[PDB]
From a paper:
In mosquitoes, the A/B subfamily of MCPs (including carboxypeptidases A and B; CPB and CPA, respectively) is primarily responsible for dietary blood digestion for the release of amino acid–rich nutrients required for egg development. In the midgut of Ae. aegypti mosquito, procarboxypeptidase B1 (CPB1 or PCPBAe1) takes on a different role in pathogen infection, interacting with the DENV-2 envelope (E) protein/virion and impeding viral packaging, maturation, and release from the midgut. Based on sequence analyses, PCPBAe1 is expressed as a preproprotein, with a signal peptide (Met*–Ala*), an N-terminal pro-region (Ala1A–Asp75A; “A” to indicate the activation unit or pro-region), and a C-terminal mature peptidase domain (Asp7–Phe305) (CPBAe1).
Here, we characterized the enzymatic activity of the mature peptidase domain (CPBAe1) and determined the structure of the full-length (FL)-PCPBAe1 (proenzyme) at 2.08-Å resolution. However, the structure consists of two molecules in the asymmetric unit of the crystal. The activation loop (Asp75A–Asp7) that connects the pro-region to the mature peptidase domain is disordered and could not be modeled in our structure. CPBAe1 contains one disulfide bond (Cys133–Cys156), which is the only conserved disulfide bond present in MCPs. Moreover, CPBAe1 displays two of the three cis-peptide bonds (Ser193–Tyr194 and Pro201–Trp202) present in mammalian MCPs. Residues Asp34A and Phe35A from the pro-region make contacts with the S2 subsite residue Arg70; this interaction is crucial for blocking small-peptide substrates from contacting the zinc atom, and thus maintain PCPBAe1 in its inactive form.
Residue numbers in the entry:
A (entry chain A): -1 to 78
B (entry chain C): 7 to 305
């Protein structure tokens, strides 16, 4: 009757440009259980995808900015 | 056609029961175990014959990876309902297929949370569920598995803490040395990977597994042009202990042990639209059949 609300959630796409950049994503995943990494590999050119709750969005993006990673907001509102 | 929609767990078991009634000479359906919430975890055994090599195929350990049970179900449909088109993998090969390892999580992802991943067994006072593919007892808990109960990669209270992973263990062990091919279907990413999941050091017989895995990728490329990346797990994924392929390779002593990451689709990769199921499972079966045929030729 009732289901989890994804209101305000976003999905980000990140394409690491080196093994070191991909490793940064791995440490972020391992250290922040509230983030939902849909996909993360070492494959060159692969796009990592992370589902992020509203309370985590500002901190997550700043971590991306801090490490110079390229990202795109691939889903702006999962809409519930 | 089972390839037109994502089936619920009860529909899957009803489909298996129908096959056991319609094909009593070819098929036997049995309960490998019971999920935490009480659901029947079934296998279908296809073409049981003394002396046969056995392929064990499972899917749906991770709740949201819906295309994997669909691929396992399509494989069942081809082998059972279209056996005359699949004799090359039905002469000396027996198949045991577990289309859903984690029915509680699978159903929860249909009812409540599409991106649920783990089981639903409570792990304490705060959260529910264990990552089944971090729960197998081989180098368990040593790398790449969270110790936090609420994390999506939680390794479990102990190894084999989940009845779902114990069901896989019991079903494989029951084969008593006859299993030559263990295959675990996941999503997504277009990868055909083999041990070791937990370390970068190559296993001593990695070339034999690579031979099988390349045959699957090659057949897929010749059928649809889709590319698959083949290699040892750590070539593509960060090291993680407790995966089912590591355990089947090292403890169940299955010489060919492979994890297949099936194609993604939809906005999340995990959720290709139902209209796209048929092409994905058709292409996936091409690779799966080609790997089984290679195994049939090796044993
Ligand atoms: Zn998976």
């Amino acid at each position: 009757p009732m289901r989890r609300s994804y209101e305000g959630y976003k999905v980000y796409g990140i394409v690491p440009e080196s093994p070191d950049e991909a490793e940064i994503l791995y440490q972020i995943r391992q250290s922040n259980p509230d983030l939902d990494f849909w996909h993360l590999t070492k494959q060159p050119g692969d796009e990592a995808r992370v589902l992020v709750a509203p309370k985590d969005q500002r901190s997550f993006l700043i971590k991306l900015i801090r490490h110079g990673l390229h990202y795109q907001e691939v889903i702006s509102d999962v809409e519930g | 056609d089972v390839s037109t929609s994502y089936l619920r767990h009860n529909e899957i078991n009803e489909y298996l029961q129908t096959l056991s009634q319609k094909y009593p000479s070819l098929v036997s359906v049995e309960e490998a175990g019971t999920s935490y919430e009480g659901r029947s975890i079934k296998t279908i055994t296809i073409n049981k014959k003394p002396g046969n090599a056995v392929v064990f195929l499972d899917a749906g350990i991770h709740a949201r990876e819906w295309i994997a049970p669909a691929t396992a179900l399509y494989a069942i449909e081809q082998l059972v309902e279209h056996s005359s088109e699949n004799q090359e993998v039905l002469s000396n090969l027996t198949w045991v297929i577990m289309p859903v390892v984690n029915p509680d999580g699978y159903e929860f992802s249909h009812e409540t949370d599409r991106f649920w991943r783990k089981t639903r067994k409570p792990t304490g006072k705060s959260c529910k569920g264990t990552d089944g593919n971090r729960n197998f007892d081989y180098h368990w808990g040593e790398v790449g598995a969270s110790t936090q109960a609420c994390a999506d990669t939680f390794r479990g209270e102990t190894a084999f803490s989940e009845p779902e992973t114990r069901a896989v263990r019991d079903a494989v062990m029951k084969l008593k040395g006859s299993c030559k091919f263990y295959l675990s279907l996941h999503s997504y990413g277009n990868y055909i990977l083999y041990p070791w999941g937990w370390t970068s050091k190559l296993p001593e017989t990695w070339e034999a597994i690579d031979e099988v895995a390349q045959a699957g990728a090659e057949a897929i490329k010749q059928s649809t042009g889709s590319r698959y990346t083949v290699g040892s797990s750590t070539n593509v994924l960060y090291a993680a202990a407790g995966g089912s392929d590591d355990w089947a390779f090292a403890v169940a002593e299955v010489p060919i042990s492979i994890t297949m990451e099936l194609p993604g689709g939809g906005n999340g990769g995990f959720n290709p639209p139902p209209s796209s199921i048929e092409k994905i499972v058709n292409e996936s079966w091409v690779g799966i059949k080609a790997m089984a045929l290679k195994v049939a030729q090796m044993f």
